Every structure is written in structure tokens, then in C-alpha cells.
Symmetry: D2
Subunit: 327 residues, 4 copies
């Protein structure tokens, strides 16, 4: 059938930075995370490396994606699918070739898939300020991130959902620890620290006769996986404008809605969340200059030059928005 | 939003739509659009004010609005039926039922408050699927509630739990006695929305309508608690299953939504190879038959018995129901 | 080897109604629940029947036992060990010989060992009056019973404790529903109905040619397991005096402690919980007349005459107490 | 209503004992017996009255006592060390440390309230086993808190959670700013009691001492929140690791209790077939040797540092520690 052919053609660029993820969501009946995750899992022969029954994986993937909110413009299954697919490409970078095991790769991928599951569409601070049960439960510390990990794992325990049923205790335990570490790193309050470490790791870069980086201890191997997935999560600004633009309008819609919510209860309107005093263009350039670029610049210097085009794409989007700035 | 305490010219239109709050058939879907998807917050506020519930229970307005919005925020916008619109619908419907002649001055303000509050939280945080589905899938929700009245227990837990958020305890000024009473009634009412309790509830209601004692004003006479809570439980149960009794234009909107939700479940069940639940197979659909099936075995027996209890008060509602049944009979393709 | 030989001998009375359960508590190292369970399981060959790895089984029993409060005088591991063994003997009752299946038997025994796990030492009403988290979670309905179940299961997910790992998706669903049905039947507010139904069923009792009780549908089969475990839980007044008295003292200590707790908070003091207006004896007689006797009078009916010595001990034990009531 | 928070017929002796509430070395075990096992309720009540916290934060007396009894009720009576007596001890020690001359007028009342409240809940609902044990069994606890500071996150959650039981919200009259400020501090303080953070906590304290500043009055100058909370964290951390600095008669009771708990875990660890944790093997126990090690590598380095920060205020405390160290030294059987 035609509709299926168009989907398959789109899925062909799965290993490409710039996948038409939105197009894919439209064609799979809004199951981008499921299709992309299953596709990426065959391209990596993961189902076979870990003996993952076909039906189990699909059932879990459908369930996980079902626990992403369809009423949320940004933090939904499309964003999940996108970070997953982005990490997938980052993993295949030449400077990291052969560096990670099948388990560590399965970790950064699973982590990415669940990194924002059941996201309410509001920031940690909003959850804290309203005294939400979630905030009370996690003591105001990485409330959302802890909850994401929590739901991600808990969903494994559903009927025919354990995609790690055939792993070994030694493996499940190792996978668990890595996913926790990666996801908790997606919390922006950890950004500044993650970047500092990343830089220090680039000023002690160690390559091999194969030119590929050398990762001795766990602390170094995980630190790359954290920045990797962190990079994927903050990758929309480095994608083809057509994509970046959809992400921006979606993220802003969510901030404005949070702003309305805060303006409903008379709270101070959060930054960038006020639709009556907004600078969408300014904010984007600001977000890139103080966070996105300073981060990706360090990532490029790590896998130099495997990401030269990505950084270049980012600098051009930076200007595209700039040359759109009124006052 | 009002410039100098004076309405906005949309907020005004909302206000005029809300003049039919005491009427069966309120344009709830419009009110939802007009209020910015705040049908639950505005209809609850309207009802609390009219029934003078804020002064009687010393509920500060800010706390009420904040809670309401918080409660409404916890209904799922991505759910076609079990959302804030259905909640607002059930609240306003119970509100109209409470005002019936046959029950005039029968319930105390605390019982009224419980019927309305229970209506507002009755389906909060509904995931869009049934109890059976959560059970067969091994959801944590089902395990927590040991597969018994899973959703109903969860709705209650969430409804009360939300009272604890910043400036959300609308019952802060009720004495412990008032709170323990309110709470038991609200729990008794919401658990009674579970369909598995349907038959027994109806049976006791018929049994009541039989031994039914009345007058002093021609109004119903309720002795003990078992009787009063039983009536209130059926009252909210009737409001929850009242869509088939509303004007056809409303009823069909409700049907599309529940059917959509039923199909989405059928789809999700199928994807997993699970036995497809009744009415859920969007491929072997019999919408027209479903409604007739639903009206003859559940809705009509219920409202007929309810019409008996408060007769003649509910004649028009029973008629509209009987009339909506025929209409669906026609629609049945042969 | 000194107290061990002594413990083995003591277990020779496992299928006997009146086990010196307390000795087994000392001799076993405060593991009455773990040992009685390990023995009973091997006997009914439940380990081989459901392929229960000796490891897991013991590991769950230990996780479960540890989850019984050692500070609580009554509702603890000894009581749970008592109920499991009392239930055991009841299942081996002749009039019921060959009625229940290996799966139903496992339920009954499992339901018993967890029927009171993690009991706080206070009644549901106390938890309800204080707006305890547990009561808010279960809506003031069977608060402790719901909790008992929830911990019974969740504790399976611990480390190598999932005993029912070698059962089918069909078995596990049956057991689960049976365990839940049983445990929730122990809630006293359910007592009246369970008795009325048990009696109504004794009125329409039916057997096969061999005289084996004929339990047709699920309603009947579970209603018998429910009341059975209910009789076990309410069996201390039917045990030899020497036992009954230790139990009565232990529950009164718990009642009084709850009473002191209510007194400190200016709360109304529950019945039997006021050590200043106590009638410990009048209470035992009252308890036996309105509840224990009517329940046991009917169970003896159903298993005529398997339980007669039991019933007789009950009427005798009531007398010993009645003679202690002053005035 | 009663004098010291609870009812007691030995009130006289309890009264004389509580007179030493401002002194290092309080007979906490004796107060625990005289109070009817209510050491935490009585000592907290005494401290709040003494520091005039009820009036300053408009805390109703009945709400304070109700909360205190609830909190105390949630420490396990079957745990030899991490119980309500330890909680009471740590509270009273923090109270003494807050009164040190070098810190006079340095902390606000809200910071004082936070440090004391944090101390009272710091180990609430302790199971009697380490985080490692909870992690190596995949316990629901070790899973809710992604293996990071399991017990500490749980102590905080339960402590704050109990504020929601009937008449237990002792912070009901503080403003939103005060409640948010208090909460963060309490949270920062209790997480810091995790031993896994000791070394880093100690380093930062040394950095502070090395660059120690004093005001016109010989009291510590603490500008930013970071230095403020840091002092408070080390302060409660010191109080938690203060038993080796109390009169030997007290230290020895604490050592017997802590070891009895370590051995309860050692047993359980070999039952489930696990690697016995340090100091938990009751067959190869070097108790005296352990104390010497604990003092040498943890307690002494920590108190010597606190002592420099408040020099010479803690000279006697540091002296008693050293005497207790040498005492166990002479007990070690070679
Ligand atoms: N296009 C964007 N514009 C502005 N902020 C963004 C954008 N993309 C990501 N962010 C920020 O990065 C954060 C990453 O966290 P999360 O959204 O939870 O993955 C978001 O919460 C935003 O605050
Ligand atoms: N229009 C309708 N057609 C068919 N079934 C309905 C309709 N309205 C309600 N129901 C059923 O009645 C239940 C009422 O419970 P709920 O609405 O979920 O509180 C629904 O879950 C459906 O199973
Ligand atoms: N010996 C006894 N004397 C008085 N009441 C008892 C005795 N044994 C059990 N009960 C009651 O029976 C109930 C049975 O439920 P439980 O013991 O909680 O499983 C207890 O909660 C007590 O209230
Ligand atoms: N007397 C003691 N002997 C040995 N270790 C101790 C002693 N007192 C405290 N500790 C250690 O300090 C930790 C403080 O944590 P906690 O007691 O859980 O707040 C304990 O878990 C022990 O590891
Ligand atoms: Zn995120
Ligand atoms: Zn994200
Ligand atoms: Zn419902
Ligand atoms: Zn409903
Ligand atoms: Zn019980
Ligand atoms: Zn029991
Ligand atoms: Zn601690
Ligand atoms: Zn401590």
C-alpha cells in the first residue's frame, strides 16, 4: 500500500541526522516512538543480541508511548522518538566507533526512549511551587527526571512488557544503573556541571592507533553517554530549520500554556512563559548562545570532526532567527 | 480578566450560557469552548455560589478556584469522553437532580456538598481505558487496588489528594465531624459509579420505591443513612448515565466521544492480541445497536425507577430518553 | 543440633491443631513463619508441583517475615505463622478431602502467610481518624487488608522472591484473584456476610458418591477458602487454653497500646482499648459468643465431624474465661 | 495540657532531668524512661518552648504535640539504634550546637527551626538496615529513589508527609516564602546526613575554616546561603555523629545499640545468602577496634574541624572524644 511505502522510505533515513520525525508520526497513526524504536532495534540487531521477543518489544513500546501525553506540544512521543533517533546517530559517530558495548548502547537508547515519559507539560519548579505530590515524593530534587525513570521501569512490569526478561542479573543490574545515570543527567540544573566535566574530558582526550577515543573507567564512559543523550535532548536547534521550527513553536506553546496556568493561580509568570511579553526569536538566539552552542561546541571538540556539519547547521539556525529579530 | 470588575465580551456570552445551569440540556460543550476549556471550574463555581456553599462552609474563593482548576487540570484533555467536560456535565446534572420537587428540602447542605463534590472528582485522572483493561495488562493501578474498582478508587484518591496542593484545601474550615461525614458520603457515592455495582444499586432503589414512604409536603421521606446515601448514590449514578436522556444534539456528541474512546481501547487491545472488549471493535461496529442495547438494559430501567421515585418530576427526561431510543432504532441499518 | 533436634520433633505436630507455635518461634530463631512454611510446602510437594526453587521460596518467606513488626505483640510473624499452620490443618480436613486443587491450596496457604504483613498494631478506624496516608490511599475501606495484599505481592518483586515464577499466565491470574479474595475476607466488617453465605451454603450442602464435598462454581469454592482462612485467623479461642491465653494477653497489650495512643491525642478511646475501664474477660466471652462461636459452629457443620474437638475446646475455653468475670 | 508535653506520674524527676536540656551529656535514656518512651516529644516540646518557637511561628500547642507524637510513633521501637531516642539525642545535640557562643545571633529563627526540625525527622521510619542492603534486594524503597540516598530521601518524605495527618501541620501559619525556605533547608540538611557525603562535606568545612571570617562581634560571618546551609549541614551531621563525644556512660550505650543493629543485619545478610557488611559479623566482631577506627577516620577529623570553626567553644567536647578513644584502645583484645 502507498501509505506504507511512504513510511518505509521516510524510515530509510533513520541513521541520518535530520530524520523527518514529524512526517513519520503522521504516517504511523501517531506511533513514531514505536516505529523508530523498533526500526533502530533491528538496524542494531538488538532484539537478537538480547533475545527480545518481537511481541514483547512492540507491546512495551506501545505502552511506553501511551504513557507520553498527546495533549503536550513538546514533551510527547515525537520528542521521545526524536531524542532516541538522535542518540542513535550520535552513537554511530566515527570517533566513538567500537567504544561502547551492546549493553551500554542499549542503555543510552532505552534511557532516551523514557527520558520524559508521562511529562505533565510543566517544569519541576511549577510542581514544587504547587506542592504537587510528585514534588513531595522526590523532595524537590529532579522531580520530573526521577518520575520519568520511575515510570519507564515500572512499565516493564506490565503484561508481556519486560523486554529484558532474557537478560542476566549481571546485565539487568548494569543496564539499570546506566539508565538512571543518563536520565538523571537530562535535568537542566545539572547542565553547567555536565559541560564543565565534558570540557575537562576534552582537555585530556585520549585516542588510539585507530584514532577512536579511549574510555578506560566507568566515570568517563558514562560521562560521554550522559552528554551524548543530553546533546540529543537539546538537539532541535542543530536540526534542519524545517524541523527546528516545529520544535520551537511546540516548546513555546507549552511554555505559554504553563504561563497561562501560572497566571490562573496568580503565580509569577515563569521565564519565556508569558505570551503577552514574549521574544520567541530573542529567546531562541539566547538559548543557543548560552546553552546549546556552548554545549555542542564541546561535543564537536570531542569527536572532532564527526560533528562539523551539525555545529555548522546550528550556527546557521542561530542567524536565521537573529535576522528575524524585531524589538 | 475583567476591566474594572466588568465582564469581557466573551466572558459575557459565557455568563449568559450559564443562565441555564438549573436546566437539563445545558450547552456544556459550548461553555467548554467559551471558558477556554474550563467547563468544570466555571460550572462548579456557578453552582457553589447559587447554592451559597462558600458562605455556608466558609470556603475562601481563591482556594475554591485554585482547587477547581487543579482538579480540572487532572482530567485528561487527550481523552474523548472521560474528561473535564464529562465531569462538568455530571456535576450540573446532579445539581439539577438535587433541585427536584420531590426532594425539596430533604438533604442537608453537607449532603448536597458531597453529591456535587463527588460528581466533580468521580472520573478524575481517567486514562481512557476500562478497569478490565488495567487488570489484564497488569497496570500498577490495578495491583495497588487489588483489581477491585480500580479506576473508581483512583479517582477518589486523586480527588482528595489534590486538596493538599498549595491553597487547595476547600474544606479547611469544616470541623472534623463535618469532614468525616462528607468524606464517607463522597467515597460511598463515587464507588457506586462502578458499573459492577449497577444491578444491586438499582435493585435497592426499586425496593425503596416500593416501600417508599412520603409526604408532609408531598416530598420524599428518608429515615436512616442507608436510605439517604442510597438515593444520592443513585442520583449521581443517574447523572453519570444521563447523556442518553439529553437532547439528541447533546447525546450524539457524547456517543461519538465514548465510542471513539471505546475504539481507541479496542485498537490498543488488538495491537497486543488481547480479546477485544464489547463495542470496542471499530471494524465490527454496531453503534446504533449498542445505544439501543445500552438504553434498554441499563439506562431506561434506571431512569424509569428514578422517575418512579420522584414522579412526576422526571417525566420529560424519561420521555426524551424513550424518544432517543426510537430515533436510534431507525438509524439501525437493516 | 541441641535445640534443632528439639525443633524437628516439635514440627512432627505440623498437621495437628494445637502446635506449640511459640516454641517454634524461639527454637527457629524467631522464624516461625519461615519454617512452618518450608515444611508445609515440602509436604504437599508444592516445590516440585509448581517448580518452586528452594532458594526463592525461602528468600520470599524471609522477606515477608521481616516485614512483620517485631514490636507488635499480636499481629506479627507468630500470628501469621499460626494462621498458615491452622489453615494447613484445615485443608487436610477429611470431610473436605480431595476437594481443592494444588493451585487453590497454594492460594489459601499463601494468602495466610501474608494476610497481616506489615500490620502497624492499630485498627483501620485509627488509621482513618488520623488521615493516615494508608487510609487516604485506600479510601477508608479495608485499609489494612488492601495494604496487606499490596505488600504481599510487591514483596514478590524483591530479590529472588518471585516464587510463582514457574506458573502460567493463566495460573498466576487464578492464584492472584484467589489470594486477594481471601485476604479481603479477613476484614471484620465483611464477617457478617461471609457467615450468612457460609451458613446458606451449609443449608444447601452437596456431595458426591464418596462423600467428597461438591463445590461447583467459583463463588462456592472461594467462599469456602475465604471462611476457612477466616476461621484460621479467628482460631486462637479454639486452641488449647494454654495457647489461647497467651494470644489473648498479646492482643490486649496491643489494644491497650492503641488506647494509650488515642488517649495522648485526646481521641475517643476504642472499645477494649482502655486499660482503665477494661473487662478483658467479659470481652473474650463477648467475642466468643457474638463472633467466634457462630463462625466455628458453622464450619464444624460443613466438615462434620472433622471439627468437634475444636468446637468443644472453644466452649470449654469460653467457660474458663466466663468464670474469671467478677461481679 | 501536661507540663512537658506528655502525661507522667514521675513528672518531678522528668522536670529536673530536662533542666540539662542545654547541656552536652543530657541523660536522654533516662528521659526516655521517665517520659514513657516519649523522649522526642518531650525534648522537642522543651526546646520549642525554650526558644519561643511556638509564639514566633504561631504554632498551636496541640498541633505541635500531635505532630511530635506522630513523628515519634513513626520511628521503629524494634530498632536498637535508629529510633526515637537517637532522634531525640540528635535534636538536643543540634540545639546545644546552635547555642554555641561563636554562632550567637548568626542564624535566623527560620534557620534555627529548620535545623531542629531536620534533626527530629532525619531518621524517621528507619528499617534498621543500610542503603546498600535496601539496594541489593531491589526493595521498593531503593527503586523509588533510583538507588541514590534511599533512606535519607525516605526520612524526608515521611517527615513532611506526617504534617498532613489530623492536626499535624505545625507550619500552617508560616507564609509561602517561609515554608519554601524552610523546606529547602530541611531537605538540604537531611540529605547531607548520608555518609556517602561525609568526605566532601568535611572538605568544604575545612575550606571554610581556612578562610574563616568573624564580625565586629566574635561570631561567624556567613554571607550567602551556600555558606549558611553548609554550616547547618555540618552542624546536624556533627550532632548525628556525636555519641563518641558524650560522657562515656552514654557513648557505650550508643555503641551497644548500634552494634546490636549491625549484627541484626549481619544475620539477615547471611540468611539471604549475601556478603556480610563491615562490622556486621557477630562472629568476627572487633567492636572496640571498630570504635577506634570510626573515631580515628571519621568522628575526630570531623569534630576537630568543627572545633576550629567555633574555637574554643567545643574544646571540652573534643577532649571527651579523645578520652573515649583511648578507653576503647585499652579494651581492644589482641
Ligand atoms: N527550542 C528550544 N527553545 C527553548 N528552550 C528549549 C528548546 N529545546 C529545549 N529547551 C529547553 O531545554 C529543556 C530540556 O529539558 P526537557 O524539555 O525536559 O527535555 C527544556 O525543558 C527547555 O527549557
Ligand atoms: N452513551 C453511552 N453509550 C454506551 N455506554 C455508555 C454511554 N455512556 C456511558 N456508558 C457506559 O457507562 C459507563 C459509565 O461510567 P463512567 O462514564 O466511566 O463513569 C461508561 O464507562 C460506559 O461503559
Ligand atoms: N483473642 C481475641 N480476642 C479478641 N478479639 C480478637 C481476638 N483474636 C482476634 N480478635 C479480633 O479479630 C480481628 C481479626 O482480624 P486480624 O486479627 O486483624 O486479622 C482482630 O483484628 C481482632 O479485633
Ligand atoms: N557509635 C558508632 N559506631 C560506629 N559507627 C557509628 C556510630 N554512630 C554512628 N555511626 C556511623 O554513622 C552513621 C550515621 O548515620 P545514621 O545513624 O543512619 O544517621 C551510621 O550509619 C554509622 O555508619
Ligand atoms: Zn526532560
Ligand atoms: Zn526531553
Ligand atoms: Zn467512571
Ligand atoms: Zn463518569
Ligand atoms: Zn488482619
Ligand atoms: Zn490476623
Ligand atoms: Zn540517617
Ligand atoms: Zn542519625
Amino acid at each position: 500500500t502507498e501509505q506504507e511505502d511512504v513510511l518505509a522510505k521516510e524510515l530509510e533515513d533513520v541513521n541520518k541526522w535530520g530524520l523527518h520525525v514529524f512526517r513519520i508520526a503522521e504516517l504511523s497513526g501517531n506511533r513514531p516512538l514505536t516505529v523508530i524504536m523498533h526500526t533502530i532495534f533491528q538496524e542494531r540487531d538488538l532484539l537478537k543480541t538480547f533475545k527480545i521477543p518481537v511481541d514483547t518489544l512492540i507491546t512495551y513500546l506501545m505502552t511506553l508511548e501511551d504513557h507520553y501525553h498527546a495533549d503536550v506540544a513538546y514533551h510527547n512521543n515525537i520528542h521521545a522518538a526524536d531524542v532516541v533517533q538522535s542518540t542513535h546517530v550520535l552513537l554511530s559517530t566515527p570517533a566513538l566507533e567500537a567504544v561502547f558495548t551492546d549493553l551500554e548502547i542499549l542503555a543510552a537508547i532505552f534511557a532516551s526512549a523514557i527520558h520524559d515519559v508521562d511529562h505533565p507539560g510543566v517544569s519541576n519548579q511549577f510542581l514544587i511551587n504547587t506542592n504537587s505530590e510528585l514534588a513531595l515524593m522526590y523532595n524537590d530534587s529532579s522531580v520530573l527526571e526521577n518520575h520519568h525513570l520511575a515510570v519507564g521501569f515500572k512499565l516493564l512490569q506490565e503484561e508481556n512488557c519486560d523486554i529484558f526478561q532474557n537478560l542476566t542479573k549481571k546485565q539487568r543490574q548494569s543496564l539499570r544503573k546506566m539508565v538512571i545515570d543518563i536520565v538523571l543527567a537530562t535535568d537542566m540544573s545539572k547542565h553547567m556541571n555536565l559541560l564543565a566535566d565534558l570540557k575537562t574530558m576534552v582537555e585530556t582526550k585520549k585516542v588510539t592507533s585507530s584514532g577512536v577515543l579511549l574510555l578506560d573507567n566507568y566515570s568517563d564512559r558514562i560521562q560521554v553517554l550522559q552528554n551524548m543523550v543530553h546533546c540529543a535532548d537539546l538537539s532541535n536547534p542543530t536540526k534542519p530549520l524545517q524541523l527546528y521550527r516545529q520544535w520551537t513553536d511546540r516548546i513555546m506553546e507549552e511554555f505559554f500554556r504553563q504561563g497561562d496556568r501560572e497566571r490562573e493561580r496568580g503565580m509569577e509568570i515563569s521565564p519565556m512563559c508569558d505570551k503577552h511579553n514574549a521574544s520567541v526569536e530573542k529567546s531562541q538566539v539566547g538559548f543557543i548562545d548560552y546553552i546549546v552552542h556552548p554545549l555542542w561546541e564541546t561535543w564537536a571538540d570531542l569527536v572532532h570532526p564527526d560533528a562539523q556539519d551539525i555545529l555548522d547547521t546550528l550556527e546557521d539556525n542561530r542567524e536565521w532567527y537573529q535576522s528575524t529579530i524585531p524589538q
